[PDB]
Amino acid sequence: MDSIDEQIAIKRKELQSLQKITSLTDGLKIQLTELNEQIKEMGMNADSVAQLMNNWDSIINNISQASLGLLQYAEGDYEIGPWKDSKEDLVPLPETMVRIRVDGNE
Amino acid sequence: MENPHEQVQANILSRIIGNVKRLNESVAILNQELVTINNRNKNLEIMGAICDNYHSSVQFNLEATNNKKPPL
Amino acid sequence: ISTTDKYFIEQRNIVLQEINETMNSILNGLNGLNISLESSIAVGREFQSVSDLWKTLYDGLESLSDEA
Amino acid sequence: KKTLDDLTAQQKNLQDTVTTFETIISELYDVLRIISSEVQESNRTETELVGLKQNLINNKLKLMNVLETGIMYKLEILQEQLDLQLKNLEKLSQDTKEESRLNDTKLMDLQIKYENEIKPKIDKTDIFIQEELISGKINKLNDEIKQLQKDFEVEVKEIEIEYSLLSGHINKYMNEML
Amino acid sequence: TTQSLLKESESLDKITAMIKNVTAALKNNLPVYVNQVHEVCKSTNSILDSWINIHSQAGYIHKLMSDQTYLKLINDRLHNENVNTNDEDGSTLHNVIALKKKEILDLRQKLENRKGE
Amino acid sequence: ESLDRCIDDINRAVDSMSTLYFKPPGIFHNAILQGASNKASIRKDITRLIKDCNHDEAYLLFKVNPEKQSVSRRDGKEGVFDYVIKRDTDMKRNRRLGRPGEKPIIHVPKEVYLNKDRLDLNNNSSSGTFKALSAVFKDDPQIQRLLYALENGSVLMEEESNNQRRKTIFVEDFPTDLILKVMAEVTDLWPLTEFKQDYDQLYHNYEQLSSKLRFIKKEVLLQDDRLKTMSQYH
Amino acid sequence: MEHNLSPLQQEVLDKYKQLSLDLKALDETIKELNYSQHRQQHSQQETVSPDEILQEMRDIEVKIGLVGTLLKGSVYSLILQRKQEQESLGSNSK
Amino acid sequence: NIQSDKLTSSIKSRKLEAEGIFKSLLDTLRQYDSSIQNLTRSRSQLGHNVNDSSLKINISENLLDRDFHEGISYEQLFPKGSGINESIKKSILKLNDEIQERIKTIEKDNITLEKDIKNLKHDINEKTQINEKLELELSEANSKFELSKQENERLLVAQRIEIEKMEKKINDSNLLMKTKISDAEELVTSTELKLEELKVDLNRKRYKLHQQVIHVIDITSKFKINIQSS
Amino acid sequence: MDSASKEETLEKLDQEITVNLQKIDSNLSFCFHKITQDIIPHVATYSEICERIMDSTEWLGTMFQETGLV
Amino acid sequence: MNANKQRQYNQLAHELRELQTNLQETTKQLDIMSKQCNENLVGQLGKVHGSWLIGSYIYYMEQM
Amino acid sequence: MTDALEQSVLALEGTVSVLKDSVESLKCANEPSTNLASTMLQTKRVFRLVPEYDVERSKLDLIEEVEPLVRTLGDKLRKSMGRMQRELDTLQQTYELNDLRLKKNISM
Amino acid sequence: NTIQQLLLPKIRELSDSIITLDSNFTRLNFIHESLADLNESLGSLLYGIMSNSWCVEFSQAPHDIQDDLIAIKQLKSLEDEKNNLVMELSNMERG
């Protein structure tokens, strides 16, 4: 047969290489887990900023909804106070609006 | 006839290569997504910069004149 | 010239001098008021630009009556 | 001078031609604005009016479609169903009165049998039981029973008296033997 | 002469007409105009003052939140009220400065001891 | 002559100052300024502009959707909320396609409020309630024709016989169970308490009298087969 | 001595007094318009003055820069800064 | 020669002016024929086939080609009684008035159609409340059938209940008749049989007692014989 | 040491080669699953939030570009 | 030693090298992404907009 | 052999080291961002605005459309109860009919 | 006669003064309109802000920002003292 010691040496060197590869792969595993956690918390921060940002959209809808008073009222209603021509009357507020509990608690 | 383990290793090694290839592909796809996001986010910091500038400027204005009212 | 005519002439002279001094005063006051008004227009001229570039948020009649 | 006269003729002909063309042009423009602003505008208004006419005619046709094959068909079918219900309640009342007269005829017939045949025969049975059976045949049977019982009892008592007489005679004969 | 007299007479009466016109305008139309524009500018001043007020409070909040340390303190205060909400005194800013002053007194007595050393 | 021409000039000028019109303050001007004027004024304005709704009333009239934190009408009929939010949503989607923002960014809901509030001021043809109903029931011809009938007294249904013709069918013709189910979905669409008590009263009326009637009906069926049996017997 | 003027002349003279009086009236009205003690005497109105003029309008102007000019200046500074890193990148390349 | 040159220059200027004005006239006539054709097409769209040649104006395009020694005048193209202002213009105003009175007639026809339309909504409305009253009578007829056949059933059932109770009472009456007659006859027969049985029993008892009397007599006789023989 | 035992060691090195390959396979598969099922979905949801962020504040964007011509 | 195994390890080396390059690219992209998130998404938009909103909130609540 | 093995080893080592560095940098960058996102950017929406126009319109619908609908529905339902009550009377009368006929016929 | 010749000029200058005043008030009305629409726009934005703030809650907004602010400057100074003290300590330890 072939001299045994040669294959013995080859097998131990592949052994050492393989154990090092396994260790490096475990390290890769842990780093991947930490990276996914990092990405998750950055996504959470972005979600919080989106929650902080939705207020602008809600403001836009509130203004659009309440703007109906302009064509609700008429031209002759506008001359209040100093603009009354000389020859109590519901000063022209916008479309009156109501609130509703939304958080599920009443 | 033949050392029994060899084929096993072969098969095992084959599997390794396969999944590693998938790893490659997976990672590559990630890059693409990542890359896209960055370009698609190329607007956001712009807005922020202006916003940052705006904030700074107003504070500077609030030191230019003494109209800065005390907090509550 | 008759004595009554002469008296009437001096009366017109005096009253017309009074009109002259009064109109000098009036023109001075009107010029002052007008210069102040020109100054107010000069300072207010800038507001047109900001009003236009901020009307883009909510104009109302500019677009609402556009549909009319 | 001959050239002068010829050229003068040319000039007057040119002037006449120019003024003729100018007046024709002016007339053409005037009658053209007549056609455009008055004749063609009138034709446009006429076309709009006949368009309104066609719209009114189409509305009229649609309203008759709503009328006959719509509303009048609805009136026809509604009246058909109402008339169906009306002959139906006619036959209903007819059947009601026929079965009602059958029912009251049946009841008054059987009541007459109860009161004029059943009741008199009940009374007849009653008087036959009391006057003829109870006060009559049954009572006479009881009376004959009592009379026969009395006859039997007196015969039995006479038989016992004969027994006593014979016993006394035997007792006397007993003493007579002395 | 008479004709000149009639000429000046009509001049004067028409002039009197137009001066009554201008004074009527100056008493009726002009004052309400200036009052209206003045009131509108006053309202504009009020609106802009409100704008400066919200901007000032925003700048104050930005200055306060720009600190990382205050963020840490509010964070573990949240952690604490999750752990126990009753003990407000546990996480306060005045307790923080009191413990800071205690730390500084310990520091200075250490420095004076080392100087004595 | 020059004095006369200056006279007509100043007459024209004074007329001009007569014709000048200064624009009066508008809507949001008044709202914000009175809501920031004085403590009593700010309280009155905060009461006028935003009134809190009765939680019972809001619950009875509106679905509240806590997962999306939204509010909608129970019947599903579109309101100003539906119009404004849907318009904002398809604006967002159009912008996602790279289309630019529109001017002005704030749009008054003109047409939706027009076509309805001028009608109110004056105050396919079925109203919103029946439309939402026909939406909510299935496409069964029986239920839809019952809806048609109670909307206009009787339904013009088409005869199943070979003689294709239209005939009217009235509300009593459909079974009582179907109309009760219609009323049930109606009171589901309007949880208001008066309707709920009306429904449970009426359904308890049905459950006693009509259900006992049905029991008596099956029992008379059996007892009538008994009648036929004894009639055959003698 | 009683001056016996012609009576067209006398009526014209009365025209002079009446014109005089209503010019004094107009002068009074314009003085009121330019009157500077508004609300300083017994009064409650306002007169066209720095109260409505340069004193008033610059007070609005100093604040108006917060919304109008500062907003534009922010993006202008952004553009200038963007040109700044563009020049820096060009210098790095060169 | 000065007059000759001046008049020649004026002739040349008027010549170029004549060519320009003639070109303008030809353009005007061509666009006129276009306008006339358009008007004819528009009128024919309403069925009014206007004769195009009647309104068109004919001008010779070679009129100016003649030498200038020969005169050209308005009467050549438009003699008296046939000028544009004379015949063509007046005819076109007459056509305008014809279209105007057509407009008036069509407006009257439209007003008549509108009146017929309002009368048609009137008839539709009348026939509609007729229809809804008839539907009310049909619903009322269905309901009246309901309660009507129903109360007919009610009274018919009532009469049959009365009939069946009285039939039952008559059945019990007949059973009572048969029972009472049978009981009375049975009682009479039983009393008669009891009388007969009592007659038989008492007669046999009488015979038994007589036989016992005979036995007693025999006993007495035997006792007497025994005593005497002793 | 020994001969039968040195053949035993030979088989031993074979054995830990095999199990080490098994561990390598398992760890790489776990890494692949981590990338495929966790990291990429998180990147996608981050994309969604960034879309919502840039989307909501766009009216500021129009207001800015209408004047600054950016 | 088995030539098949040798080619298997050659393929493994190629795959691991390209994996290293791809991971370095991913590291660059992730670093840039973190820069956008922490410096702009929360650094400027978040901070400034939260400042505006909270300041306006406080201002209006004090005027209840 | 060993060349390819060591090449694989060094490649994996490079990936692991770069991943360690990127993770550490990500943590350092995230810590202040996470701290800021946790506390003051927290926001709760408690109310949603509802124009009073739609509330009054819903009330008007309930009182002038749904209210008349329920009125006619109630009237027609009461006539329905009347009809079922009637058929209860007819059914009990058929019951007395059938029961009495059974009794008399069985009796004879 | 000369009376009317001297009346004419002051009428002329009064006329030019009044017409220039007319022009000035015209531009004043223009500026007033511009300011009114500016007011309406800013008021609409402010009303939107106000309505949104009257329906949202921020659980972590401070209340005594004065005390927080003076405290944070005092703390920042105390950390500055900390840095110089520790630097001196390390310097004397090294030397």
Numbering used by the authors:
A (entry chain W): 1 to 87, 115 to 133
B (entry chain Y): 1 to 72
C (entry chain X): 13 to 80
D (entry chain G): 270 to 447
E (entry chain V): 60 to 176
F (entry chain a): 3 to 125, 155 to 265
G (entry chain Z): 1 to 94
H (entry chain F): 434 to 663
Manuscript text:
Kinetochores couple chromosomes to the mitotic spindle to segregate the genome during cell division. Knl1c functions in the spindle-assembly checkpoint (SAC), whereas Ndc80c, a heterotetramer of Ndc80, Nuf2, Spc24 and Spc25, is the major microtubule-binding component of KMN. Many fungi, including S. cerevisiae, utilize the ten-subunit Dam1 complex (Dam1c), which self-assembles into a large ring around microtubules, whereas most metazoans contain the Ska complex.
Cryo-EM density was not visible for the Spc24:Spc25 subunits of Ndc80c. The coiled-coils of Ndc80c emanate from the calponin homology (CH) domains of the Ndc80 and Nuf2 subunits (Ndc80CH and Nuf2CH) at the surface of the microtubule to fold across the outer surface of the Dam1cRing. Following focused classification and flexible refinement, a distinct interruption in the coiled-coil became apparent. The flexible hinge between Ndc80cCH and Ndc80Loop permits Ndc80 complexes to fold as hooks across the Dam1cRing, explaining how the coiled-coils of Ndc80:Nuf2 dock in a parallel configuration across Spc19:Spc34 despite adherence of the Ndc80cCH to the pseudo-helical symmetry of the microtubule. In contrast, the Ndc80CC-mut2 (Spc19:Spc34-Ndc80:Nuf2 coiled-coil contact-2) essentially had no effect on rupture strength when combined with Dam1c. Our molecular models therefore account for two EC-sensitive contacts: the Dam1C-ter-Ndc80cCH and the Spc34-Ndc80:Nuf2CC interfaces. At both, residues phosphorylated in EC would cause electrostatic and steric repulsion, explaining how EC-mediated phosphorylation suppresses kinetochoreDam1c:Ndc80c assembly.
